[PDB]
């Protein structure tokens, strides 16, 4: 069996950046070694093949070095759809043993997030549910707190929270927090109220509405 | 398109081909042997005859794989099998 | 050449799971490469099942090979994969992919597998726009579907821009919930109409819902 292991495990790089990843094979392979990105929900893509040879239509940016035992992918000016997760690949064995992967993500400026609430529609409504959305549009970095109040009290264990993945031009996420409720307990309450922290906030920004209107 | 013709010499620890690839030439040529996990690196020799040398004996069926001089890569499993004859050609 | 996957998306536990690659532009007959399959499980990188030369010879990986049986069929130009007794552990999305000997050069799209139970179509609640200054947000709520995929578009693919299609979180009911965003000039809600397009094939479920005010 050969082992391939690539460092790092994940980094986080600005637009522009020379990025590189590396990749250690237990043997020498000479130059058995292929390259590819997997952006998820997409098919990977083999980028690099031979340790250095640009597979044909993949862009001049990505570049690959080494022989025998360290190899490198180089991305010479890193561009924002460029997050992904990077996998090195060994052909001598029958195996093709793959690396487990460099996640790469992208660094910016700090962004705060737009917030915007959402009462349950009449049609839910009408099934015996109540679902109140939350959501934080185009910010950065990741962490981001969302405190539900109904009726100027705080909410808790009622709510789960989803997140984009890096947005593809700006590098920004999203993230949408749902309250979820029977139509009963909405019914029972005035102000539903969401309470946004992040970085990118001097202070808590928060949204909400009145049942009624 | 392609074929191998085994060349003499061939024995147990030493297996020539000649390779001929229709309208492109042999850049490399590797095999593998049936029961092995390893591709192994062919020397190229003259007239599209390449070799391999084993420190332990060979035993077919054999795979190969190759890069043309244009860049065509390809693998064909048990091309040539463990009982060979000197001087057949094997084609996929 | 081309290749696509095709077969249940949903597969009960202790059953065997099924898929076909279908290979276009190209005859598997001809020979010169391995037909493989590859596949990610959640949070892991991307692990080998096995590939298959169209003379019959196949090369699993040994973690799975006792319950791995690959096969080929020249005559419709296709190689597919069956994986007995599966669990959730099994649950990934398949990737299926031409080898040279070298490279994994040509992949599908992957297809989704839930190892499961018990197939629902979404409803869809409008998240009518709520007001930046200059933007409005909007969205659409498909609730309580099961398995995964959806697909969502805005206005038959003509509104991409700024959309923001959140991943499915699965919910304490056992059944899967996102929302799909998109903001849009405030001075756009009087003229323009939005109508999100959910798609859920498992249960063969199209809705078009119109956002309004």
Known sequence: ?213 | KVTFTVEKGSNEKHLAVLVKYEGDTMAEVELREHGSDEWVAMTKGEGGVWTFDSEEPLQGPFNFRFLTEKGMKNVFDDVVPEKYTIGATYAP | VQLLESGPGLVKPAQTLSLSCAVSGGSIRSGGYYWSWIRQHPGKGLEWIGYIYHSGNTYYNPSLKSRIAMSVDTSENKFSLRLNSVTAADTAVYYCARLDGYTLDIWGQGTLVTVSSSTKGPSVFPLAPSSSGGTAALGCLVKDYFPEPVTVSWNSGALTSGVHTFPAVLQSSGLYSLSSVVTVPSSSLGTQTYICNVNHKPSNTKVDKRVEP
Request: with cysteine.
């Open chain 1, 1 to 213: 069996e050969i082992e391939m292991t690539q460092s790092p495990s994940s980094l986080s790089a600005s637009v522009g950046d020379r990025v590189t990843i590396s990749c250690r094979a237990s043997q020498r392979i000479n130059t058995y070694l292929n390259w590819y990105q997997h952006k998820p929900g997409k098919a990977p893509k083999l980028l690099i093949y031979a340790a250095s040879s640009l597979q044909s239509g993949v862009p001049s940016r990505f570049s690959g070095s080494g022989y025998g035992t360290d190899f490198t992918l180089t991305i010479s000016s890193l561009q924002p759809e460029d997050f992904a997760s990077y996998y090195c690949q060994e052909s001598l064995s029958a195996s093709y043993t793959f690396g487990q992967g460099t996640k790469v993500e992208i660094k910016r400026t700090v962004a705060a997030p737009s917030v915007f609430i959402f009462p349950p529609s009449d049609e839910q409504l009408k099934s015996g549910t109540a679902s109140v959305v939350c959501l934080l549009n185009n910010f950065y970095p990741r962490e981001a707190k969302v405190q539900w109040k109904v009726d100027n009290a705080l909410q808790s264990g009622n709510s789960q929270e989803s997140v984009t993945e890096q947005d593809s031009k700006d590098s920004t996420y999203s993230l949408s927090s749902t309250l979820t409720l029977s139509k009963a307990d909405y019914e029972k309450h005035k102000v539903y109220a969401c309470e946004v922290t992040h970085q990118g906030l001097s202070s808590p920004v928060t949204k909400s509405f009145n049942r009624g209107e």
